[PDB]
Amino acid sequence: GSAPKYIEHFSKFSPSPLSMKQFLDFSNACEKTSFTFLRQELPVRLANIMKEINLLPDRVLSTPSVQLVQSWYVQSLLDIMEFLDKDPEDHRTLSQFTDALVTIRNRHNDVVPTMAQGVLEYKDTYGDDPVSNQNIQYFLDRFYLSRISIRMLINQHTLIFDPKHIGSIDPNCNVSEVVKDAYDMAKLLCDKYYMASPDLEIQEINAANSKQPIHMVYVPSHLYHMLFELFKNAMRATVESHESSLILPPIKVMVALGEEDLSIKMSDRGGGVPLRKIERLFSYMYSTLAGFGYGLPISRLYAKYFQGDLQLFSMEGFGTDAVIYLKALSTDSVERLPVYNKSAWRHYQTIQEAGDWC
Amino acid sequence: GSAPKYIEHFSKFSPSPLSMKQFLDFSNACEKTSFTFLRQELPVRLANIMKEINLLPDRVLSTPSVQLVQSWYVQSLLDIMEFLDKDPEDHRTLSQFTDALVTIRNRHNDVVPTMAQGVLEYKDTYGDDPVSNQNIQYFLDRFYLSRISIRMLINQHTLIFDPKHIGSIDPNCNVSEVVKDAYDMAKLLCDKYYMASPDLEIQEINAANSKQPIHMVYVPSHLYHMLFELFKNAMRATVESHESSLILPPIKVMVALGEEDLSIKMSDRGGGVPLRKIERLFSYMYSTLAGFGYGLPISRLYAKYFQGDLQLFSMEGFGTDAVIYLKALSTDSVERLPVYNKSAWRHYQTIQEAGDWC
Ligand SMILES: Nc1ncnc2c1ncn2[C@@H]1O[C@H](COP(=O)(O)OP(=O)(O)OP(=O)(O)O)[C@@H](O)[C@H]1O
Ligand SMILES: Nc1ncnc2c1ncn2[C@@H]1O[C@H](COP(=O)(O)OP(=O)(O)OP(=O)(O)O)[C@@H](O)[C@H]1O
Ligand SMILES: C[C@@H]1CN(C(=O)[C@@](C)(O)C(F)(F)F)[C@@H](C)CN1C(=O)c1ccc(C#N)cc1
Ligand SMILES: C[C@@H]1CN(C(=O)[C@@](C)(O)C(F)(F)F)[C@@H](C)CN1C(=O)c1ccc(C#N)cc1
Ligand SMILES: [Mg+2]
Ligand SMILES: [Mg+2]
DSSP letters, B292-309, are S--HHHHHHHHHHHTT-E
* Residue numbers followed by a gap, chain B, C–N over 2.5 Å: 26, 162, 288
Spatial CB neighbours of A210, under 8 Å, sequence gap ≥ 6: none
**% helix / strand / coil in chain A, to the nearest 5?**
50, 15, 35
Distance from CA of A338 to the nearest CA of B (A): 5
Q: How many CB atoms lie within 10 A of CB B308?
A: 25
Cβ–Cβ under 8 Å, residues B284 and B124:
no
Query: Determination technique for this PDB entry?
Result: X-ray
User: Residues B84-91: contacts with CB within 8 Å, 24+ apart?
Assistant: B84/B39, B88/B32, B88/B35, B88/B36, B89/B32
Selection from A208, A301, A265 nearest residue B313 by Cα: A265
* E strands, B39-125, in order: none
B215-218 and B251-257: which strand pairing?
unpaired
Q: Which of B350, B305, B293 is nearest to B332 (CA)?
A: B305
Q: To 10 degrees, what angle do helices A95-107 and A32-54 make? A: 30
Separation CA B289–CA B285 (nearest Å): 20
What does the alpha-carbon distance between residue B119 and residue B114 come to, in Å, rounded to a whole number?
A: 9
Resolution for this model in angstroms, one decimal place? 2.4
Closest CA to B115 of B290, B287, B338: B287
Query: Which residues on chain B are in Cβ contact (under 8 Å) with A339?
Result: 356-358
Helices (H) and strands (E) in chain B, counts: 13, 7
The bridge status of strand A318-327 relative to strand B170-174 is: unpaired
Please tell me the distance between residue B12's alpha carbon and the centre of ligand 4 in angstroms. 20
For the structural domain made of B1-164, what CATH number should be given?
Answer: 1.20.140.20
Instruction: Give the max Cα distance, chain A.
Output: 68
CATH 3.30.565.10 domain extents, chain A: 165-336
Domain spanning B165-336: CATH 3.30.565.10? yes
Residues 6+ positions from A172 with CB-CB distance below 8 Å: A164, A215, A217
User: Alpha-carbon distance B110 to A197, whole Å?
Assistant: 57
Query: CA angle, A28 as apex, A24 and A34 as ends, to 5°?
Result: 70
Q: What is the distance between the alpha carbons of residues B35 and B160, in angstroms, rounded to a whole number?
A: 12
Burial class (CB in 10 A: 0-12, 13-18, 19+), A330: buried
B51 near B344, Cβ under 8 Å? no
The DSSP output letter for A249 is P
Half-sphere exposure of B200 (CA within 13 A, CB side): 24
Would you name the residues of B annotated as active-site residues?
225, 229, 232-233
With contact defined as beta carbons under 8 Å apart, do B336 and B307 qualify?
Answer: yes
CA distance between the termini of chain B: 52
CA distances from B318 to A178, B249, B274 (A): 21, 11, 11
Q: Are B330 and B338 in contact (CB under 8 A)?
A: no
Residues 6+ apart with CB under 8 A from B106: none
E strand or H helix that includes residue A152? helix A130-160
Distances from the Cα of B357 to the Cα of A33, A189, B205, B208, B275, angstroms? 27, 38, 43, 46, 19
Nearest partner of B153 among B340, B324, B305, B310, judged by Cα = B305
- Nearest CB to A317 within list B256, B323, B356: B256
Give the closest residue to B216 by CA, choosing from B155, B306, B311. B306
Q: Where in chain B is the domain with CATH 1.20.140.20?
A: 1-164
The 3-state DSSP class for residue B7 equals helix
Amino acid letter, residue B249: P
Q: State how beta strands A261-271 and A318-327 pair.
A: antiparallel
Helices B32-54 and B3-10 cross at an angle (nearest 10°) of 110
Nearest beta carbon to residue A354 from set B272, B341, B357: B341
The residues with which A263 forms a beta bridge, in sequence order, are A256, A325
Residue A112: count of CB within 10 angstroms of its CB:
16
Q: Closest Cα to residue A154, out of A60, A34, A267?
A: A34
Longest dimension (CA), chain B: 68
Given a contact cutoff of 8 angstroms between Cβ atoms, the answer to whether A274 and A320 are in contact is no
Number of other residues whose CB lies within 10 A of the CB of residue A344: 19
DSSP state of B332: T
- Preferred mutation among B309, B316, B352 to probe A, highest tally of A CBs within 10 A: B316
Rounded to an integer, what distance in angstroms lies between the CA atom of residue B41 and that of residue B45? 6
Q: Collect all residues with Cβ–Cβ distance below 8 Å to B56 and sequence separation of at least 6.
A: B66, B139, B348
Q: Which residue's CA lies nearest to atom 26 of ligand 4?
A: B37
The DSSP symbol for A338 reads B
* Cβ–Cβ under 8 Å, residues A328 and A216: yes
Strands A318-327 and B251-257: unpaired
A12/chain B closest Cα distance in angstroms = 14
Cβ–Cβ < 8 Å for A24, A81: no
> What is the Cα–Cα distance from B37 to A339, expressed in whole angstroms?
53
Measure the CA–CA gap between A350 and A247, rounded to whole angstroms: 49
C-alpha–C-alpha distance, residues A82 and B170, integer Å:
74
Residue A50 CB neighbours (<10 A): 23
Alpha-carbon distance A97 to A38, whole Å?
10
Find out whether B263 and A315 touch, Cβ atoms under 8 Å.
yes
- Integer CA distances (angstroms), B22 to A168, A255, B231, B332, B335, in order: 60, 47, 32, 11, 11
CB contact under 8 A, B260 and A272: no
Residue of B14, B206, B207 with shortest CB distance to A358: B14
Q: Does A260 touch chain B (CB under 8 A)?
A: yes
- C-beta separation of B141 from B297 below 8 A: yes
Q: Give ligand 1 pocket residues (Cβ under 6 A).
A: A 229, 233-234, 237, 268, 270, 273, 281, 287, 290-293, 295-296, 320
Strands A200-206 and A251-257: parallel
